[PDB]
Amino acid sequence: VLSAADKGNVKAAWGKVGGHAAEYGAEALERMFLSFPTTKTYFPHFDLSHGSAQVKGHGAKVAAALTKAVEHLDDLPGALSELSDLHAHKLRVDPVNFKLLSHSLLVTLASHLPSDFTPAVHASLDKFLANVSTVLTS
Amino acid sequence: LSAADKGNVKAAWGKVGGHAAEYGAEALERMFLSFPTTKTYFPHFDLSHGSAQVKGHGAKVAAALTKAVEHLDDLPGALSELSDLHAHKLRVDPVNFKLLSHSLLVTLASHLPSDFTPAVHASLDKFLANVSTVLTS
Amino acid sequence: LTAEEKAAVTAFWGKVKVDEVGGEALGRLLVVYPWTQRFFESFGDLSTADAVMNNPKVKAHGKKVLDSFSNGMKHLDDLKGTFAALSELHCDKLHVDPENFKLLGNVLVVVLARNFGKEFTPVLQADFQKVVAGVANALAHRY
Amino acid sequence: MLTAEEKAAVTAFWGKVKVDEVGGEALGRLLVVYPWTQRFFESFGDLSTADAVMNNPKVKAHGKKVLDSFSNGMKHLDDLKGTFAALSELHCDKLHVDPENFKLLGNVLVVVLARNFGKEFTPVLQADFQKVVAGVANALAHRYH
Ligand code: HEM
Ligand code: HEM
Ligand code: HEM
Ligand code: HEM
């Protein structure tokens, strides 16, 4: 449901992420788990310590999903249908936790892209992550 | 909304029938009493029980929900003017939509206890959340 | 709550059938907010609204939840103390996000409305909103 | 909150913060990212665009004062309730700001710290600052409970 302006800012920012998307996904998860320990209980099968290969590999998966989303902003429900079922039906992820990951992602992106993470880009990315979150909790 | 949710919403709103304006006013009154932060959006109203302004405004709210019920496949379009008003002019905090939505569910449950099943409650919750999303976009 | 508001909620609470109301409230939470079912895997059949509402473990648990509200209703100026142990349990052991405490309190208010009609006035309901906000806040305190 | 050792580590980081810069940025981003918050700032003049918001001298001046209150909190981390009691009265009793927004501004401040400090704003340090901004938001909301 993003505006044209928001779509533009999201595609531009995600372009700047480029080949670091997996790295940023992994850092976002790490920041989520450290700042918001309630989220750790969704990953009992993971070692969640710094530098865990499971967190690293999961970050690459999350990055691939966000890249797919960026490439299909006009049909997120379709593009993310399998992931929506997984998160909402199988995992029963509490909607609040999408806010916590989204914040963690913004912190990570701001850290790495300080010139590109303008107020407008921050606002657009916030709405993007909220839209992804809505789809994955439907 | 899903087709099943749309069915439940249209059926429930049918059961409301001629009481919609009354229930809109009651929902506002319940919002203002329960959640006093919301009163600061209406300093121009007499907010006492049975006030003409609350009655009139409740009728407007109800008429917008009726419009929504009649246009469930295009809420963004149907509510465009109301979205601009709430988000751009009035700058209504998104939290307050949750408070009015809850107040509307309490009102509907009060008046339609036989019809307000768990499934209907869930569908009405999603409807009011969808309306709220549109009005805050 | 003021003394007048406490008297009003105390009086109303006496009329409430807590077993029935608690089971309805918990069942509605699970139906309306289905992610909450994550916490109740051991309760058996939650597959449909009817299965949830008629599930004996949901009804039994709901009664226990409402027994804790009954305790709170006697300690409205010390909800923090009253709910301290349950806060530890829900926050530190179960890792329930505290937003859900507000959701269950609001479902309880909807259930009271459904069950009491014109008796559950705007004023009385507003008093119960103060109660459920207090309970949710107390339960979140270990965060 | 925090142990004495943990307070030393967050104090050391906080010493680096330029409150005029960071405060103005945090408040401006709140107004841009969460535009309903502009309801409370009609007297601040031009908030019509993102650039107007960020360059508005009243927004920058106010943000500095907001960050000075965080600096005061950083010196009284074991008594945030008392430290923020007057500000709680202002925001809750006088302005009726919904307390969700206190959490939003705290999280914007964390994003701004990240933007301004890069590598140095580690996951560990950020997690302790999450505890601090949660405590500030909770203290500010106290007059609603
Ligand atoms: C932007 C939001 C999110 C995206 C894009 C996302 C993406 C993904 C992807 C791509 C997978 C892998 C699916 C597969 O292997 O088939 C996954 C799995 C998972 N996600 Fe998420 N996710 C998001 C939010 C969350 C949140 C908020 C939580 C919980 C706090 C969560 C918990 C999980 C869990 C527990 C798994 C399964 C882990 C496993 O099998 O090893 N996700 N997610
Ligand atoms: C389901 C949600 C809502 C609906 C359907 C709704 C509907 C309406 C309608 C139909 C009007 C009149 C529009 C006009 O005159 O052109 C209106 C005005 C207004 N609404 Fe809402 N509204 C909703 C939520 C809210 C909330 C949550 C607040 C604040 C707590 C709010 C505050 C106002 C105010 C301040 C006005 C203008 C009052 C006036 O004209 O005197 N609305 N709303
Ligand atoms: C007003 C809010 C709440 C109150 C007053 C409350 C109260 C209680 C009480 C009194 C118990 C213990 C029952 C006993 O004596 O065995 C309990 C257990 C539990 N509560 Fe809550 N609760 C609340 C909200 C929630 C929410 C929102 C969830 C999850 C979404 C939750 C999940 C649980 C679980 C999983 C248990 C343990 C179930 C088991 O033993 O298998 N509670 N709660
Ligand atoms: C952690 C959260 C917050 C802190 C620490 C904080 C701090 C402050 C401080 C220190 C002042 C007084 C500045 C002075 O000396 O004049 C102030 C004023 C104010 N704050 Fe906040 N604030 C917070 C959140 C918010 C939020 C979320 C809003 C609105 C959405 C808000 C709206 C205002 C307004 C309207 C004033 C008065 C402005 C005026 O003089 O016209 N604050 N705040």
XYZ file of C-alpha atoms and ligand atoms in Angstrom, chain B residues 31 38 41-42 44-45 57 60-61 64-65 82 85-86 90 92-93 96-98 100-101 104 128 131-132 135, ligand 2:
70
model
C -14.694 6.537 24.651
C -9.630 11.552 23.786
C -10.014 16.410 20.434
C -13.466 17.880 21.201
C -15.612 22.610 21.281
C -18.221 20.089 22.443
C -21.367 13.494 16.019
C -21.835 11.126 11.638
C -19.488 8.397 12.868
C -19.228 6.736 7.953
C -19.226 3.152 9.266
C -12.369 11.340 5.975
C -9.483 15.080 7.590
C -8.309 12.714 10.350
C -6.864 16.777 12.774
C -5.421 12.110 15.191
C -3.074 9.833 17.091
C -7.156 6.797 19.606
C -8.640 4.720 16.782
C -8.040 1.636 18.931
C -12.897 4.276 19.672
C -12.886 0.807 18.060
C -17.744 0.513 19.455
C -12.714 -1.474 12.695
C -11.209 1.411 8.852
C -8.680 2.773 11.366
C -8.187 6.840 8.302
C -13.752 4.518 13.232
C -13.164 5.670 13.404
C -13.691 6.984 13.052
C -14.693 7.347 12.215
C -15.502 6.425 11.318
C -14.810 8.767 12.286
C -15.728 9.533 11.573
C -15.795 10.906 11.595
C -16.688 11.686 10.792
C -17.724 11.133 9.850
C -16.464 12.990 11.070
C -17.166 14.195 10.467
C -16.504 14.592 9.169
C -17.034 15.883 8.576
O -17.734 16.694 9.241
O -16.784 16.105 7.370
C -15.376 13.014 12.002
C -14.856 14.182 12.536
C -13.933 14.167 13.596
N -13.361 13.088 14.183
Fe -13.637 11.223 13.690
N -13.918 9.270 13.175
C -13.212 8.260 13.658
C -12.201 8.277 14.612
C -11.815 9.418 15.317
C -10.952 9.410 16.459
C -10.307 8.203 17.028
C -10.884 10.710 16.868
C -10.201 11.246 18.054
C -10.117 10.660 19.265
C -11.673 11.504 15.960
C -11.830 12.851 16.048
C -12.614 13.621 15.188
C -12.708 15.065 15.258
C -11.984 15.959 16.226
C -13.556 15.436 14.258
C -13.995 16.820 13.880
C -15.095 17.262 14.851
C -15.953 18.349 14.363
O -16.279 18.417 13.174
O -16.436 19.131 15.167
N -12.254 10.657 15.040
N -14.995 11.735 12.344
